[PDB]
Design a protein around this ligand. Structure first.
Ligand code: ADP
Ligand code: MG
Ligand code: MG
Ligand code: NA
Ligand code: NA
Length: 330
């Protein structure tokens, strides 16, 4: 039995999603797994999407201030994990920020900053503690979500790609695959080891925060690990000489003013890496290090505006700088 390498990529969930697999299984089995990966992404776009009228999440948001809504176990679990990171991060990551994000989402389209009072009003409808998750303990009991605060809106943009990368890994493993690189718009999961007959760690690239995005500035060698990056120049618009990026500080209702250009989180679960990358970007370097002490199983890599790079002890020896303008502090 020979090793073969496969990849497939499609535009779905608003970005380019690519999965690369090495396998000795019959090619038909790999093709079937990849078919299911991309069917899953299509289906989940219709569950999780914040910017569509026909998604399950949009239906949930339409019931804010009303009765609990039945959701499937998967969406319930994702919301539970999102609220966990909201609590642990002091709301730096906030999955109920839709009232504010939606104003900024039209801002992007219109290239215009939201009004002050409108923005001040939106911040009053973002209390994630008023998302009530309930699930009965008896056999087959439904899972429900209630948005108790009038006009509050869920937006899972900062955790959905991580969730989907984890769901894809679970699917690949269900198909008896153990070597893959999952890349959902840059949200990476490195499953197992790649092939060279030699088995090698995956060399995951981290971009220059200001890069055209072509070349990575650094690579990190990893196995069975998600690598998720949140950064200041990945999505933004400009107006009158000021840049407004897409990661909001919930305290100000404005794009976060932070001391790092990007934060990359390395974790066994991409859900966790995605939520933490957002929280850490909002919190800034020192407070991020404090938060991360609560998660011993994760590592982090910070790129500063002066091109210094700091990486935690669990990954620093695995980092290689490719763009010599950057310096890895040791
Ligand atoms: N502080 C925040 N907490 C949670 N979600 C946020 C926050 N700010 C913005 N969002 C939503 O999450 C998205 C940012 O997600 P993030 O994972 O940080 O970046 P990326 O889009 O590169 O994956 C935004 O587009 C918005 O939908
Ligand atoms: Mg995130
Ligand atoms: Mg993300
Ligand atoms: Na990103
Ligand atoms: Na800040």
């Amino acid at each position: 039995a020979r090793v073969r390498e496969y990849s497939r990529a499609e535009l779905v969930i608003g970005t380019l999603c690519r999965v690369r697999v090495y396998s000795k299984r019959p090619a038909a089995e790999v093709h079937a797994a990849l078919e299911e990966v991309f069917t899953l992404l299509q289906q989940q776009e219709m569950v999780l999407s914040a910017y569509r009228d026909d998604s399950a999440l949009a239906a949930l948001n339409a019931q804010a201030g009303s009765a609990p809504v039945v959701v499937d176990r998967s969406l319930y679990a994702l919301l539970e994990r999102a609220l966990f990171f909201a609590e642990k991060s002091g709301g730096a990551f906030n999955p109920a920020l839709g009232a504010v994000v939606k104003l900024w989402n039209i801002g992007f389209d219109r290239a215009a900053v939201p009004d002050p009072d409108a923005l001040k009003e939106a911040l009053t409808r973002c209390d994630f503690r008023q998302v009530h998750l309930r699930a009965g303990v008896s056999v087959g009991a439904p899972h429900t979500v209630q948005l108790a605060q009038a006009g509050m809106q869920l937006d899972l943009g900062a955790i959905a790609k991580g969730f989907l990368a984890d769901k894809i890994v679970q699917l690949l493993t269900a198909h008896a695959l153990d070597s893959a690189l999952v890349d959902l718009g840059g949200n990476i999961f490195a499953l197992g080891l790649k092939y060279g007959a030699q088995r090698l760690e995956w060399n995951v690239g981290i971009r220059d925060p200001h890069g055209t995005g072509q070349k990575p500035a650094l690579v990190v060698s990893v196995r069975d690990c998600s690598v998720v990056t949140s950064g200041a120049y990945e999505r933004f618009f400009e107006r009158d000489g000021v840049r407004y990026h897409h990661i909001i500080d919930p305290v100000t209702g404005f794009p976060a003013h932070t001391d790092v250009d990007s934060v990359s989180i390395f974790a066994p679960r991409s859900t966790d890496a995605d939520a933490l990358a957002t929280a850490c970007f909002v919190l800034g370097y020192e407070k991020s290090c404090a938060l991360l002490r609560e998660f011993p199983g994760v590592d982090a890599l910070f790129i500063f505006p002066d091109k210094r790079v700091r990486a935690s002890a669990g990954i620093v020896d695995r980092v290689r700088v490719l763009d010599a303008r950057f310096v890895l502090e040791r």
